């Protein structure tokens, strides 16, 4: 229904700001951290971001295509990343619950980082094109 509280069309979400110490909203599932390191060849004990911004590159009429950019040591990159929001009524819903979106990322060594296995102190801007998980 068009007055259903906290109901938003996923394809029209333009951007996200995700915090490591905040939880997602959830009605059907279970709140999770908005921003979570879930693995990687460098592990989640290396530097981890506290906030990540993601843009929906298809917000102006197309399917969702999340791009999440940050600055990391040149030793590191994001591996696979996954954005996921809670479908309002089900995982098949094109409407999602406001506040329910979150990012999971893996923190890998780059091919240069694998040579050294520690931080260089030099940084690079890096963008991940996330896969989307329907839930």
UniProtKB/Swiss-Prot annotation:
Q: Does the keyword Endoplasmic reticulum apply?
A: yes
The chain's Lumenal topological domains, given as residue ranges, are 2-135
* Keywords, sorted A to Z: Calcium, Calcium transport, Endoplasmic reticulum, Ion transport, Membrane, Signal, Transmembrane, Transmembrane helix, Transport
Q: Domain of life of the organism in this record?
A: Eukaryota
User: In its UniProt record, which GO terms are filed under biological process?
Assistant: calcium ion transport; regulation of store-operated calcium entry
> According to its record, what are the GO cellular component terms?
endoplasmic reticulum; endoplasmic reticulum membrane; endoplasmic reticulum-plasma membrane contact site
Tissue spec. comment: Highly expressed in macrophages.
Subcellular location per UniProt equals: Endoplasmic reticulum membrane
**Has the keyword Lipid metabolism been applied to this entry?**
no
Q: How does it assemble?
A: Interacts with STIM1; the interaction is inhibited by the interaction of STIM1 with EFHB.
Protein task: Negative regulator of store-operated Ca(2+) entry (SOCE) involved in protecting cells from Ca(2+) overfilling. In response to cytosolic Ca(2+) elevation after endoplasmic reticulum Ca(2+) refilling, promotes a slow inactivation of STIM (STIM1 or STIM2)-dependent SOCE activity: possibly act by facilitating the deoligomerization of STIM to efficiently turn off ORAI when the endoplasmic reticulum lumen is filled with the appropriate Ca(2+) levels, and thus preventing the overload of the cell with excessive Ca(2+) ions.
Its family?
A: Belongs to the SARAF family.
Q: What does its UniProt record remark on the domains?
A: The cytoplasmic C-terminal region mediates interaction with STIM1, while the N-terminal lumenal region mediates regulation of SOCE activity.
Q: What is this protein called?
A: Store-operated calcium entry-associated regulatory factor
Residue numbers of the full-length protein present here? 30 to 164 of 339
């Amino acid at each position: 229904g068009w007055n259903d509280p906290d109901r938003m069309l996923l394809r029209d979400v333009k951007a996200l700001t995700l915090h490591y110490d905040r939880y997602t909203t959830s009605r059907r599932l279970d709140p999770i951290p908005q921003l979570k390191c879930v693995g990687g060849t460098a592990g989640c004990d290396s530097y981890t971001p506290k906030v990540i911004q993601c843009q929906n590159k298809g917000w102006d009429g197309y399917d969702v295509q999340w791009e999440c950019c940050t600055d990391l040591d040149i030793a590191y990159k994001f591996g696979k990343t996954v954005v996921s929001c809670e479908g309002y009524e089900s995982s098949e819903d094109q409407y999602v619950l406001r506040g329910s979106c979150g990012l999971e990322y893996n923190l890998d060594y780059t091919e240069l980082g694998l040579q050294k296995l520690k931080e260089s102190g030099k940084q690079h801007g890096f963008c991940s094109f996330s896969d989307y998980y329907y839930k």
